[PDB]
Amino acid sequence: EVNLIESRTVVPLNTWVLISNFKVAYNILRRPDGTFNRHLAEYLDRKVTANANPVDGVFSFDVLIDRRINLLSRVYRPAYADQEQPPSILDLEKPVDGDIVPVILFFHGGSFAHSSANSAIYDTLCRRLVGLCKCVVVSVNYRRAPENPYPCAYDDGWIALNWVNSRSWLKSKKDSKVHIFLAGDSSGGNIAHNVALRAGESGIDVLGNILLNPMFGGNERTESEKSLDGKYFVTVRDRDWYWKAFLPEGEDREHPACNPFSPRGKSLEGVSFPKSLVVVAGLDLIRDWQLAYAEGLKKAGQEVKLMHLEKATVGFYLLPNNNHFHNVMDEISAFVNA
Amino acid sequence: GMDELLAVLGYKVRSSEMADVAQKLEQLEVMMSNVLATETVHYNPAELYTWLDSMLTDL
Numbered sequence: 009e010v011n012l013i014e015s016r017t018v019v020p021l022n023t024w025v026l027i028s029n030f031k032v033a034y035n036i037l038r039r040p041d042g043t044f045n046r047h048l049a050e051y052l053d054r055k056v057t058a059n060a061n062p063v064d065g066v067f068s069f070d071v072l073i074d075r076r077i078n079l080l081s082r083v084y085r086p087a088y089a090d091q092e093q094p095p096s097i098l099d100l101e102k103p104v105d106g107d108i109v110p111v112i113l114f115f116h117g118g119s120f121a122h123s124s125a126n127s128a129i130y131d132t133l134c135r136r137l138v139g140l141c142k143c144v145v146v147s148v149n150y151r152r153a154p155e156n157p158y159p160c161a162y163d164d165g166w167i168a169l170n171w172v173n174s175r176s177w178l179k180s181k182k183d184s185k186v187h188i189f190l191a192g193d194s195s196g197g198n199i200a201h202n203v204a205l206r207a208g209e210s211g212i213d214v215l216g217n218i219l220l221n222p223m224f225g226g227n228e229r230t231e232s233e234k235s236l237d238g239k240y241f242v243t244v245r246d247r248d249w250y251w252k253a254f255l256p257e258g259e260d261r262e263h264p265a266c267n268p269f270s271p272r273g274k275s276l277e278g279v280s281f282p283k284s285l286v287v288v289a290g291l292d293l294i295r296d297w298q299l300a301y302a303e304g305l306k307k308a309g310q311e312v313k314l315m316h317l318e319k320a321t322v323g324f325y326l327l328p329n330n331n332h333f334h335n336v337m338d339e340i341s342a343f344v345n346a
Numbered sequence: 347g348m349d350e351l352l353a354v355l356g357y358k359v360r361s362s363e364m365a366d367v368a369q370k371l372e373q374l375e376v377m378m379s380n381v382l383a384t385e386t387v388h389y390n391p392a393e394l395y396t397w398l399d400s401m402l403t404d405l
């Protein structure tokens with residue numbers, strides 16, 4: 009039955025190895041009964057520490073945003089100009105220099121159960137964002153399901169957003185305000201959407217959202233789900249598993265946390281919502297849900313830029329060896345600096 | 347001779363052995379669809395070739 013020749017035809021071999029390795033490892037971590045092998049998961053994951061020493065013009069440091077829950081976030085910044093010595097622990101919060109200095113609050117993917125801000129795949133992505141967008145990136149180490157399900161991840165994002173918005177050293181010279189952009193791939197994209205909703209209801213104005221292959225769903229089995237199931241790394245079976253681990257007991261996929269345009273979700277008509285850049289991989293089995301999301305925003309009168317990469321798969325942005333990565337990074341930079 | 351795009355992500359794989367690693371990943375998927383985590387904790391997760399090879403044996 010198993011034949012993976014098809015998925016190898018659409019991606020570079022090293023990309024195929026990376027995503028397939030996660031695919032097989034995650035099969036082991038997810039248990040039929042709904043439990044998760046957290047110990048093995050954290051052992052297998054490849055992690056990296058922060059580093060005050062600039063590498064490729066980027067340095068980083070970790071911050072404890074909230075002790076009660078041990079919420080950490082990693083800050084990435086471009087190397088200081090005219091730096092005679094590397095940054096000491098007292099030089100990490102040096103006021104940003106620039107009339108307009110965008111700050112991207114990033115939420116990693118992993119379907120709400122996998123990865124951390126210090127996972128190498130995400131530390132590398134954030135470093136690339138800093139250099140390709142010329143900005144500061146703050147990556148949130150949000151709590152994961154099934155141990156910490158809905159709404160824990162959203163709450164962590166809210167706490168992180170307030171922390172970022174209140175940093176005096178992150179204020180732009182122009183308007184003395186922190187220019188915030190929310191970004192995230194997979195579940196991180198879902199978190200960005202929901203944090204943005206809460207932001208608008210408060211006094212925080214997010215300038216824009218960047219969603220990469222955002223994780224959304226619903227009770228209905230879309231055509232893309234039925235046709236692409238198991239062909240390109242993802243299966244409807246694992247999608248169902250992650251939704252069940254994240255959503256409240258007894259809930260279904262029409263819960264607003266899963267389907268932002270569910271009948272249960274609040275209308276976005278005439279709401280203060282930031283402009284959005286929605287990237288959809290054509291070979292991502294939940295493509296139809298993602299396309300419906302972009303259309304939902306447009307229909308609600310929100311500003312939305314849709315990038316439908318018909319031959320891209322999940323994880324295309326983890327390696328800089330394909331045109332999808334290049335095209336998307338170009339648009340992200342244009343979006344943030346517009 | 348390691349693939350530097352994977353190395354930055356924490357994985358050590360020789361460019362010349364990428365195809366062999368790809369083969370092992372599929373062989374492991376096959377075995378899984380016909381079926382472990384206890385003995386896995388002992389293997390080096392960064393060395394994909396040996397990690398997969400070791401897992402295949404356990405199956």
Ligand SMILES: C=C1C[C@]23C[C@@]1(O)CCC2[C@@]12C=C[C@H](O)[C@@](C)(C(=O)O1)[C@H]2[C@@H]3C(=O)O
Nearest residue numbers: 030031034117118119194241242246322323
């Ligand atoms: C069980 C899973 C989890 C995947 C989908 C998959 O079917 C197989 C591999 C995944 C994953 C691995 C690492 C990245 O975090 C992710 C966002 C991706 O592109 O690929 C990950 C992606 C996700 O979380 O959306």
